[PDB]
């Protein structure tokens, strides 16, 4: 099984809400130290959200006020968008980094296609 469970595509309603699942089974001994969500445009991704040691940070203006990332359940870093725009259609990447105190590091990422339907 892949570490991150992310569907190959999600369809959301124009002007409404969508959830992009990204989940994993936490492993004892590792700490989640970074979550990044990225969006494609067009041959390179840009970071739209970071969760780091200083909290949650939206990183692109067009997502300000419209983007939430789950945090309640360990292993669930799903992203929700509000007031979906046609220009939100793209491929989105969930990227998670784990470390140990002695410095080992593991990273995984996974891509979903967001479709927006009228």
């Amino acid at each position, epitope marked *: 099984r892949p570490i991150l469970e992310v569907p190959e595509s999600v369809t959301g309603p124009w002007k409404g809400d969508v959830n992009l699942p990204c989940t994993y089974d936490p492993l004892q001994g590792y700490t989640q130290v970074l979550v990044k969500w990225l969006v494609q445009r067009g041959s390179d991704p840009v970071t739209i959200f970071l969760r780091d040691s200083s909290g949650d940070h939206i990183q692109q203006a067009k997502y300000q006020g419209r983007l939430h990332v789950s945090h309640k359940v360990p292993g669930d870093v799903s992203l929700q968008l509000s007031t979906l725009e046609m220009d939100d259609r793209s*491929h989105y990447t969930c990227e998670v980094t784990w470390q140990t105190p002695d410095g080992n590091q593991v990273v*995984r990422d996974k891509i979903t*296609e967001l479709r927006v339907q009228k």
Partner: nanobody
Amino acid sequence: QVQLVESGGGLVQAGGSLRLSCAASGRTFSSYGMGWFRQAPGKEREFVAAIRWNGGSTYYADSVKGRFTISRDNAKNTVYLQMNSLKPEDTAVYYCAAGRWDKYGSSFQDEYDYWGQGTQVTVSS
């Protein structure tokens, strides 16, 4: 699908050269990371090379660095493995795989969802 179809295998002399191809079906090729794996007799499947969806980065097993080159053509829905300076240790069945990793995890077979039936490579002393 994607269905993945490999070709290009053969029996070659040590020092020689082959090129494997992998033809993908569907229209979603360009969104997948692509990789090559191999399985030698009486051994487990192992990573060989991978290439990001956008061609931006490539990744190689240490043992094939500088001898093998992976490339892709998103317009022709094909991935290639140029295999130069072949060694007997390179003998194996070679498999093409597609996954939705972006730039991490490409060495792990578990991070791929589609696999071809493979093509056979033998390198002789």
